[PDB]
């Protein structure tokens, strides 16, 4: 390929990681007071298709976050992507599979690469810009892959995959070349998330399991983090040292600089779960949160205050608006947007001062 031994590949990973470890260290801009909302568009989507948000270092040394929804009809995949209010686009690309079968996971890679996982651990890579098939790949593992991601800056010849028992490997985009860095039982994972510097990978499941693996030192024991509680997402915050565990009604934030288990601040209870269909999401800085109440059709904004170490509601943000069960948030410099989702459709809401 280009890397002939795992030893050569590991040193490419560490080196490329060192190239970027000191970049992307500036803060995203502070959120203004938000007072107006605009319903931008209502669309249907296929919720069973998991889509991992794509992160890109920007010229201002913080990261942009692209969120993606997929609607799969009749041998086409309709995508809606945005990193803020002014970058909404809808792209249609062909579904390479027979019969209109749905991917289980869709993720992006650099150079307009689109990664499509189909059950049985079969991966197709498309160029979303030219509509060509670049790769048809099979991963030999008896366990279902539950995570697939390609970093936009670090080690950009490979993307990462992980199965639901902790096998972790890297796969070259162009060559038939791959390396396993962790091998498979105790666990049963549903999802994953990759740290900014692409050396730490968290694997987790809804029932409390949270294991962080070190991708650059093969088969070193994963560290297990103590969560009581139903996990719904784990995020590595953009500052590089918070690991945020979004649960159903609690937020747990671990401090990666200290002993495994040490919190960055006291665990936070979402108010007011009733108890109940309130939903929420935290942005990738880990400092800004938006919550939705189906009861009052209102959005509430919370801000984390590192002086007091707790979340407090911003009372100057009365945002009132159809019953959503999940949501995601984006906030590039074109404006903050909330993506409100039912189990089969979604509404995008622009938020402005």
Contact residues for 299 (Cβ-Cβ < 8 A; gap 6+): 37, 290, 291, 292, 317, 319, 320, 321, 338, 349, 351
Q: Which residue has the tokens 């201002």?
A: 60
| Pick from 315, 336, 318: nearest CA to 29 | 336
Contact residues for 172 (Cβ-Cβ < 8 A; gap 6+): 1, 2, 3, 157, 158, 178
Cis ω before 276 (30° cut-off from 0): yes
Q: Which residue has the tokens 């949160």?
A: 289
Q: What CA–CA distance (Å, rounded) separates 87 from 331?
A: 11
DSSP per residue, 190-236: -EEEE-TTSSEEEEE-TTS-EEEEETTSTTPPPEEP-----EEEEEE
Check if the beta carbon of residue 301 is closer than 8 Å to that of residue 293: no
DSSP per residue, 104-139: SEEEEETTTEEEEEETTTEEEEEETTT--EEEEEE-
| Pick from 230, 229, 228, 225: nearest CA to 243 | 225
Q: What CA–CA distance (Å, rounded) separates 70 from 136?
A: 21
What are the backbone angles phi and psi of residue 25, rounded to the nearest 5°?
-110, 10
| Pick from 177, 180, 193, 189: nearest CA to 143 | 189
Task: Please state how this structure was obtained.
Answer: X-ray
β-bridge pairing 50-51 and 105-109: parallel
DSSP per residue, 15-33: HHHHHHTTSS-SPPPPPPP
What the chain holds in terms of domains, given with CATH numbers, is 6-352 (2.130.10.10)
Cα–Cα distance list, 26 to 30, 41, 57, 211, 319 (Å) = 12, 32, 11, 28, 29
Cis ω before 272 (30° cut-off from 0): yes
Q: What CA–CA distance (Å, rounded) separates 337 from 291?
A: 13
Query: 171: which 2 tokens?
Result: 């796969």
Give, in degrees to the nearest 5, the angle at Cα 138 between 155 and 119: 110
Map residue 11 onto helix, strand or coil. helix
Cα–Cα distance list, 29 to 32, 131, 158, 331 (Å) = 9, 36, 31, 9
CA dihedral defined by 74, 76, 82, 88, rounded to 10 degrees?
Answer: -80
| Pick from 139, 130, 74, 131: nearest CA to 105 | 139
| Pick from 164, 162, 165: nearest CA to 181 | 162
Cα–Cα distance list, 279 to 40, 112, 183, 207, 332 (Å) = 20, 32, 36, 19, 22
Check if the beta carbon of residue 223 is closer than 8 Å to that of residue 212: yes
């Amino acid at each position: 390929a280009v890397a002939i031994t795992r030893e050569e590949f590991l040193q490419g990973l560490l080196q490329s990681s060192r190239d970027f470890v000191a970049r992307g260290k500036l803060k995203a801009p502070k959120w203004p007071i938000l007072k107006n909302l605009e319903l931008l568009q209502a669309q249907n989507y296929s919720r069973n298709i998991k889509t991992f948000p794509y992160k890109e270092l920007n010229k201002s040394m913080y990261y942009d976050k692209w969120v993606c929804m997929c609607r799969c009809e009749d041998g086409a995949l309709h995508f809606t992507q945005l990193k803020d209010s002014k970058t909404i686009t809808t792209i249609t690309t062909p579904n390479p599979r027979t019969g209109g079968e749905h991917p289980a996971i869709i993720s992006r890679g650099p150079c307009n690469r689109l990664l499509l996982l189909y059950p049985g651990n079969q991966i197709t890579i498309l160029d979303s810009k030219t509509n060509k098939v670049l790769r048809e790949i099979e991963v030999d593992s008896a366990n279902e892959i539950i995570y697939m991601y390609g970093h936009n800056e670090v080690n950009t010849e490979y993307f990462i995959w992980a199965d639901n028992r902790g096998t972790i490997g890297f796969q070259s985009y162009e060559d038939d070349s791959q390396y396993i860095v962790h091998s498979a039982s105790d666990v049963e994972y549903s999802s994953g998330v990759l740290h900014k510097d692409s050396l730490l990978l968290a694997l987790y499941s809804p029932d409390g399991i949270l294991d962080v693996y070190n991708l650059s030192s093969p088969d070193q024991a994963s560290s297990r983090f103590p969560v009581d509680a139903k996990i719904k997402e784990v995020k590595f915050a953009d500052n590089g040292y918070w690991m945020v565990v979004e649960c159903d009604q609690t937020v747990v934030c671990f401090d990666l600089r200290k002993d495994v288990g040490t919190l960055a601040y006291p665990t936070y209870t979402i108010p007011e779960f009733k108890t109940g269909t309130v939903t929420y999401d935290i942005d990738d800085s880990g400092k800004n949160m938006i919550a939705y109440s189906n009861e009052s059709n209102s959005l509430t904004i919370y801000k984390f205050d590192k002086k007091t170490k707790n979340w407090t509601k911003d009372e100057e943000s009365a945002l009132c608006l159809a019953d959503f069960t999940d949501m995601d948030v984006v906030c590039g410099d074109g404006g903050i947007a909330a993506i409100l989702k039912t189990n089969d459709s979604f509404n995008i809401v622009a938020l402005t001062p």
